[PDB]
């Protein structure tokens, strides 16, 4: 109890952080997670795992929520904030043991927590774009391997980089913003690995109309169908009379025929082109293309929902018109500026051109083999996700670890200004920062004592900027962990993450401290 | 809850003994470990996958070793022993040193470059095959069967493996990837002989269809696979109220008739006799077809129908309207109820696509057949592995001693701390040669140093020690061969496997 529990508190803070600072980030090492005593799972990034892991200390109890609290918020700081949750504890652990009362400087670390946000003001870059987070190439290239993406590791990036940043794309049913909604996009492995292209609007993942379908219908009024047209058995269809053994078979056949005119009515009513996430039977598809209607079926739900949110407003994904599209009541009108069905990647995809009412884009990545589709997969993800915090946060923190040394000395500057005890509250605070360079040096098999100290030598007075890194701070690496530049290597954050993880770790240390008595009734 | 170096130890620790005792069990020349149950149940096996089991397992990475083992047991099932050797080799050598040299990391990386050099050398060390010449394939199967020392029936099953699996091979992503196995259909049969079996076209339907009213033989009626929805509609298109009374029996059962026929006439539109009815099966459905004198085979699996989807090479049809040959029963095709033994077997042959056969197996009975089938199962897969990979390598130390030089040549040239894995990589090749030197029962250090020289000039391209020839030898003349991938497949695993436990410093519950 007392220290012994607050140590045990501090200990558990250190104890669990042991798992993550090895598991930390994509420098981390994957770790075996037993589910009960018997069922083991393996990742790095404790943020995932500690949620899945049973947290056996009240600290461990008080924490995983907070990382999840951070993790509910944003994936950044999650596996982190538990770090300085542990840091300042061990830091302040002896301070209280020294002369400090746990209340004394703990307000100061908040006052210290503000200096950083006082510094967050002066340190951000509101330009989130032209240099890019993990630069431009470095963003996607890092989440690329080098396979068939590698030669384009720089090239595919600034494509997908400048893609989701801003390109012509329908946001959710065309939201007037940067591509908040990601971007529809394709990795279609084939032809050259260099022929990967952004294309106008949406090259479908679809079953093209096989009935002799028109392979271009200009300015397509669209029915995007999440509804399959198919057929059902009508024991008696249109007419009655049997003048022929033909006429015996026409009745139950006429159910199929009323679609033709209704399609021809639909030719007149709700769509130039039918887009169906479901199947359009060639039987059904017959009723279309003979009217001269492009009718596309089994379209990718991703595509179509993005083509639905491309087309705009009315769509046949809404109401189900039956018997191969019962004639539209014109809640079904979609919008495509034009629709050309263009062979791309040695295959015809119908290429939706933007939208008649909206911009849209699929990018088609052309590799050889899925190994592009496997890599530009996550290359997109990062860049996409990068772009998305780039999208939302224009203000973004320049530098990964070069802030640490600044933020160290930045307060270590303001440290002495207090005098007395909370001069310490500004120090261990600024001390507890450098584990970020540590753990990144650690998990990169590097040593921040060379790296993080090299950090603190970079300054005129203080700032983290890609002005002059010889005389100032900017950026960071993972594989190394030394300051680098923003368009170069040197890392980033968006604007927001800190204050959360800041206040989180700020609050993380304090509260379990307050209790000295675990004991029982 | 487990930690770091101790994990790293327990990695090297467990993965050591994990990699080990079955190497005595390795080789056509082998040493079978005994396995005692706590009750006293005794076991004699060369199979690690088997050996993995009775042994009481605690170390969760050993469980994870069982994983990539089962994962490889899924892939080949052979070399699951051999895959965990090298990870045991890998994890043993570089790890502790290079983690006491402080990293999984350079260890992690260099196995990327451990991998490729051999992957390169593989395409150099493995030579292409005639999958066209099944004899060029047969010797492999002749080789594939005999490490566990089964020849007698397999010598035929060797050929029969070649036959179907090249046919049961039709598969394309457009890059034409062929994994296709489920096309190959095998038959438990009583009577005949292990030396009499065959591969019959389409997919022979053995397991769950003995059904005697399939008729027997279908000359060219169609077989009908129904994702219809043949279920009688008690109303016009729908199912009306049930029959609790006389009035519901007359009106409803009448409309139940039409929907069967109008679909079964759509079935008749493709003109079958045999209709194997899966979705929409109705007591009126077969009865109508039986009234149609269309044998309607019900109480049946769609797995059979998936076998039948590969028996006519067709699909199964949800379309009620206008049922087609190309819809179901693709191609002219056959269906025949055959008695091999006296068991009724539907044979649906002549898939619309060629490369259509499925393996008939006769033993003197099911069991001595199962002797064939189990070994044919190995025989048949090596095919689609040779059919997978049309390159193949002189085995043993030839396979082993080749890359280490280039690898050391790399390490020498690469001269980083990555060189140290390429040193740690170098001789890990030679452990099965040690086992081969176990297999011959000879002096390893010599034969190594001897085979080391055999790669100094010959470059051990075909030259390993083969414990079964006992000696450092050309493995081409000697004829030690496997399709390249299998080598890599064994080789690819252990890299990642080691690299896997190379990541773990933490077990946590």
UniProtKB/Swiss-Prot annotation, chain A:
Residues that hold Mg(2+) according to the record: 76
Residues the record lists as Phosphoserine modifications: 479
UniProt-listed Enzyme Commission number(s): 3.6.1.-
Chief location: cytoplasm
Protein name: T-complex protein 1 subunit alpha
Disease / disorder: Intellectual developmental disorder with polymicrogyria and seizures: An autosomal dominant neurologic disorder characterized by a broad phenotypic spectrum. Main clinical features are developmental delay of varying severity, intellectual disability, seizures, and polymicrogyria. Additional variable features are non-specific pyramidal or cerebellar signs, and visual impairment.
Residues that bind ATP: 25, 77-79
Annotated ADP binding sites: 25, 77-80, 146-147, 400, 493
Family: Belongs to the TCP-1 chaperonin family.
Any one Gene Ontology molecular-function term assigned to this protein's record: ATP hydrolysis activity
Function: Component of the chaperonin-containing T-complex (TRiC), a molecular chaperone complex that assists the folding of actin, tubulin and other proteins upon ATP hydrolysis. The TRiC complex mediates the folding of WRAP53/TCAB1, thereby regulating telomere maintenance. As part of the TRiC complex may play a role in the assembly of BBSome, a complex involved in ciliogenesis regulating transports vesicles to the cilia.
Post-translational modification Phosphotyrosine, affected residues: 169
Gene designation per UniProt: TCP1
Catalytic reaction(s) noted: ATP + H2O = ADP + phosphate + H(+)
Entry-annotated residues carrying N6-acetyllysine: 187, 388, 482
UniProtKB/Swiss-Prot annotation, chain B:
GO cellular component, one term: cytoskeleton
Role played: Component of the chaperonin-containing T-complex (TRiC), a molecular chaperone complex that assists the folding of actin, tubulin and other proteins upon ATP hydrolysis. The TRiC complex mediates the folding of WRAP53/TCAB1, thereby regulating telomere maintenance. As part of the TRiC complex may play a role in the assembly of BBSome, a complex involved in ciliogenesis regulating transports vesicles to the cilia.
GO BP field: binding of sperm to zona pellucida; chaperone mediated protein folding independent of cofactor; chaperone-mediated protein folding; positive regulation of protein localization to Cajal body; positive regulation of telomerase RNA localization to Cajal body; positive regulation of telomere maintenance via telomerase; protein folding; protein stabilization
Residues bearing the modification Phosphothreonine: 415, 444
Keyword Acetylation recorded: yes
Residues the entry annotates as binding ATP: 27, 79-81, 396, 467, 482
Name listed for the protein in its UniProt record: T-complex protein 1 subunit gamma
Disease: Neurodevelopmental disorder with speech or visual impairment and brain hypomyelination: An autosomal dominant disorder characterized by global developmental delay, impaired intellectual development, poor or absent speech, and brain abnormalities including hypomyelination, cerebellar atrophy, and optic nerve atrophy. Some patients have severe visual impairment, dystonic movements, and seizures.
Pfam family, any one: Cpn60_TCP1
Residues modified to Phosphotyrosine: 232
Localization in the cell: Cytoplasm
GO molecular-function terms, A-Z: ATP binding; ATP hydrolysis activity; ATP-dependent protein folding chaperone; protein folding chaperone; RNA binding; unfolded protein binding
Record keywords, A-Z: Acetylation, ATP-binding, Chaperone, Cytoplasm, Disease variant, Disulfide bond, Hydrolase, Intellectual disability, Isopeptide bond, Nucleotide-binding, Phosphoprotein, Ubl conjugation
Residues binding ADP, per UniProt: 27, 79-82, 147-148, 396, 467-468, 482, 487
Modified residues (Phosphoserine): 155, 228-229, 237
PROSITE patterns attached to this UniProt entry: TCP1_1, TCP1_2, TCP1_3
Catalytic activity: ATP + H2O = ADP + phosphate + H(+)
Sites where the protein binds Mg(2+): 78
Disulfide-linked positions: 351-357
InterPro entries linked to this entry: Chap_CCT_gamma (IPR012719), Chaperone_TCP-1 (IPR017998), Chaperonin_TCP-1_CS (IPR002194), Cpn60/GroEL/TCP-1 (IPR002423), GroEL-like_apical_dom_sf (IPR027409), GROEL-like_equatorial_sf (IPR027413), TCP-1-like_intermed_sf (IPR027410), TCP-1_chaperonin (IPR053374)
Main localisation: cytoplasm
Family according to the record: Belongs to the TCP-1 chaperonin family.
Record note on quaternary structure: Component of the chaperonin-containing T-complex (TRiC), a hexadecamer composed of two identical back-to-back stacked rings enclosing a protein folding chamber. Each ring is made up of eight different subunits: TCP1/CCT1, CCT2, CCT3, CCT4, CCT5, CCT6A/CCT6, CCT7, CCT8. Interacts with PACRG. Interacts with DNAAF4. Interacts with DLEC1.
